[PDB]
Structure 1
Amino acid sequence: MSREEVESLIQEVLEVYPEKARKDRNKHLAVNDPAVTQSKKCIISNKKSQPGLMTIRGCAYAGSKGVVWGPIKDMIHISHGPVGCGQYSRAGRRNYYIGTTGVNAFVTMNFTSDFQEKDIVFGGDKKLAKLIDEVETLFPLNKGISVQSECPIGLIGDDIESVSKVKGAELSKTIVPVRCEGFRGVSQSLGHHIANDAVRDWVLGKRDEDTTFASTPYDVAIIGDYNIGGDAWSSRILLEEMGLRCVAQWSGDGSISEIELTPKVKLNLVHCYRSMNYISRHMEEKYGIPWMEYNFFGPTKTIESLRAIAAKFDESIQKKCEEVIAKYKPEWEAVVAKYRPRLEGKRVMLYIGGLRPRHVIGAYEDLGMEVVGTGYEFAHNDDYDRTMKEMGDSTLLYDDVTGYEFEEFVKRIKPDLIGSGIKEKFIFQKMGIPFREMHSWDYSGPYHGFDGFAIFARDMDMTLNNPCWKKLQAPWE
């Protein structure tokens, strides 16, 4: 569509809101212009959601527990508060790991205090101490405990800092108290920030004086990759095939030892800027470790990222990077030859959280498809700044989009594919538009790396060209 038509569609969609809601939502919809380098002049981000408009955003408890701390496998994470949250967030995110669940790994488990009315009225400090004692009694092989605070804990002023400090000192254990109450902030981003602050204060500086770890000039840490079906492993195999040594993974398949060993690395490879930029900046300022953004979504982005990473080291690393690129070229070339004809010219609309709306555009372009509209759940203005460059002319940008807005935007655009979460999958499937879950990879994956590119292409081809989408109209209607 033309630029004058996207604005008309935006106005027609906004016409249904009341005055306050319309005025607020007019600031969150924009027509892309890659020339503009400041996203503040076109879109407004990181504000509170309008009440009663069916937002897709989550809470700070999600952004901390289910995002940052949860993937850590050797730790035990306590959902301090009522049951719901832990139950709703149990095993819903596919942060893959290797370990014996119930013995030394606890990712898919749900530990909760299960607050009652008497806990609200009288407190939860004694109950928390008893819970820590029972956790240590029944799960002796855990390497740490984290306390994720749910809303009531923040409201009633339960002092989990002192309980954590006392129990950790007396039991010689690392107990990290996290104030990730849902009502804090507007979305999962503040949960990311709180979890990063907890990591900085209670975990990161534990080995500040230990010098037993021998460091090589090829030490790297993957920052912000959470192994959604093995993406972290796929990236790690490429990084290790380059001659680089990965010491830490944050936090998919990550261990507390990797977090402790991170300050000894020579370079931080940040995948998700939105979630771990604060900890990357803290490490850069305190230990002098530089950090850089890398993207392993599609062959072009992967090759560019490998070359940029190899540019940070000596000639042997560059030679190994060239060897890896040459080795992996025929496979992704064959994948393109197989799947691009079936996917050429197709239009894609995306609505994901903080990073993936701009990171996956490269793969779609590698497969011959174009992105006609992308959007962020909770991303800040810097993410949109990076997003304007990657998106073409006259493409719609939306922040904190509502179900109504997304429904009519899709109705007016008629995209060939929609990539969003589980809360819009069936809405758009019943509309006759192929849908792909861009958070869990539709229980497939991994999609990062050369190995993940083939799975990505196969999944897009099977979802887009399925015979079921041509059968939604009865022959007699």
Structure 2
Amino acid sequence: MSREEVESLIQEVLEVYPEKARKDRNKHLAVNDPAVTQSKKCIISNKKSQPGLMTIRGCAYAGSKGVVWGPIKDMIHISHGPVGCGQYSRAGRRNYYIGTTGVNAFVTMNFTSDFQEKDIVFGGDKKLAKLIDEVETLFPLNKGISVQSECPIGLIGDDIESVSKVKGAELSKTIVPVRCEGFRGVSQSLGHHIANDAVRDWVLGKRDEDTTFASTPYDVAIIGDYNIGGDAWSSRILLEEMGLRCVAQWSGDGSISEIELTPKVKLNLVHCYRSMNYISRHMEEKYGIPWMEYNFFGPTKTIESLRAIAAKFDESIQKKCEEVIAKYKPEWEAVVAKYRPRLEGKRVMLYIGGLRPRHVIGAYEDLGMEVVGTGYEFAHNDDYDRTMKEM
């Protein structure tokens, strides 16, 4: 309640800023009205951060290397440039995976060119080719290389696409150049976009002329789940217990083969719309694969999403979904009965990157908590369209 109090609080808070900063930041703070359908008249998003205000946003390299490309385990990701960028993002994200690190998996390892002064002055294309050769000799079991470029790569004018093509032709390897320089874009969203573009342009269209894979009418592909602490595995067990077959996982515990086999999937289940809506739209336009957004946070959203996913198949899938719901009902009923009285009536404030502020609202409300303030670092206006109704 106290909408006028909220507006007065916003006005009082905005007082310390200079005129430019105050005028810009007034557009980014809003009082929620669930009846609003278009967020553009209520809130403004996807704009540059005001200098010297201690923003929490990252860079495009963080959104591309650290978010999308990183969870892929059988590929080797080269942080092309100075040493710090790879160091600070090393194993800082809990994208779980299965494999023997250093032999066939490389998620928690830091590959870098380690640019020096002579690299900046002269260039690093020959150094990049030599590095690719050294990776090939030292890590034979790697199934692909991706070169994530940092700021100096685009700032000095290096041609990593030509190097990638030449080395991939020479070694018969999949080399993916990603131009994810930090200054490109205002946050990690452009990093997501660039990573999706790289996946589409260099990886996705590989098993297009073959048909060796045996397809099944119950083929689904998880998109936008990065296995943070094992979330993707819980979602996978929930989907397989429904009778569907999960072919691909983007990208937590994901493999290059799964990404290449994704176009042979009947339905795409997109968890993170913000990071992987681009590739889903491309898949729908090219291969004709329908895609749909689901929510597995809390029991209510999980049941609703399970029923919605089952509605896209025959009646056997619906009966299996009902069986799964009946099986799992007592567990979450007991969890609620145990924990709700301790947490009932508490007010919670949220501030996360994208699509998590709105997704976890149902989980909090399932225990009696209420969200009083939420927001995003880099969500666009469609995310605010989606999150107005849920608050």
Shift of 1:301: 0.1
Q: Which secondary structure state, in structure 2, belongs to the residue aligned with residue 217 of structure 1?
A: coil
Identity %: 100
Distance 2:45 2:95 in 1: 28
Shift of 1:48: 0.2
**Structure 2 unpaired stretches of 5+:** none
TM-score computed with the length of structure 2 as normaliser: 0.99
Q: Which secondary structure state, in structure 2, belongs to the residue aligned with residue 321 of structure 1?
A: helix
User: 1:309 matched to which residue of 2?
Assistant: 309
Distance 2:135 2:79 in 1: 13
User: 2:72 matched to which residue of 1?
Assistant: 72
User: 1:57 matched to which residue of 2?
Assistant: 57
Distance 2:19 2:122 in 1: 44
**Residues 191-225 of structure 1 deviation map (CA, whole Å, 9 limit, x = unaligned):** 00000000000000000111000100000000000
- Structure 2 residue 242 is matched with structure 1 residue 242: yes
User: 2:130 matched to which residue of 1?
Assistant: 130
Shift of 1:160: 0.1
Q: Which secondary structure state, in structure 1, belongs to the residue aligned with residue 30 of structure 2?
A: strand
Aligned length: 389
Q: Which secondary structure state, in structure 2, belongs to the residue aligned with residue 28 of structure 1?
A: coil
TM-score computed with the length of structure 1 as normaliser: 0.81
Shift of 1:355: 1.1
Shift of 1:234: 0.2
User: 1:288 matched to which residue of 2?
Assistant: 288
**Residues 309-338 of structure 1 deviation map (CA, whole Å, 9 limit, x = unaligned):** 000000000000000000000000000000
- 1:342-357 aligned at under 5 Å gives the runs 342-357=342-357
**Residues 106-136 of structure 1 deviation map (CA, whole Å, 9 limit, x = unaligned):** 0000000000000000000000000000000
Q: Which secondary structure state, in structure 1, belongs to the residue aligned with residue 134 of structure 2?
A: helix
- 1:18-417 aligned at under 5 Å gives the runs 18-389=18-389
**Residues 352-380 of structure 1 deviation map (CA, whole Å, 9 limit, x = unaligned):** 00110000000000010000000101000
Distance 2:258 2:316 in 1: 26
Distance 2:301 2:383 in 1: 17
**Residues 42-100 of structure 1 deviation map (CA, whole Å, 9 limit, x = unaligned):** 00000000000000000000000000000000000000000001000000000000000
Distance 1:359 1:74 in 2: 30
Distance 1:355 1:202 in 2: 27
**Structure 1 unpaired stretches of 5+:** 390-477
Shift of 1:246: 0.2
User: 1:455 matched to which residue of 2?
Assistant: none
Distance 1:210 1:52 in 2: 53
Shift of 1:167: 0.1
Where does structure 1 differ by over 3 angstroms across 4 or more consecutive aligned residues?
none
Distance 1:41 1:325 in 2: 40
Q: Which secondary structure state, in structure 1, belongs to the residue aligned with residue 203 of structure 2?
A: helix
Distance 2:238 2:200 in 1: 28
Distance 1:168 1:348 in 2: 51
Distance 2:241 2:92 in 1: 32
Shift of 1:294: 0.3
Distance 1:77 1:305 in 2: 34
Distance 1:340 1:154 in 2: 52
Distance 1:199 1:355 in 2: 22
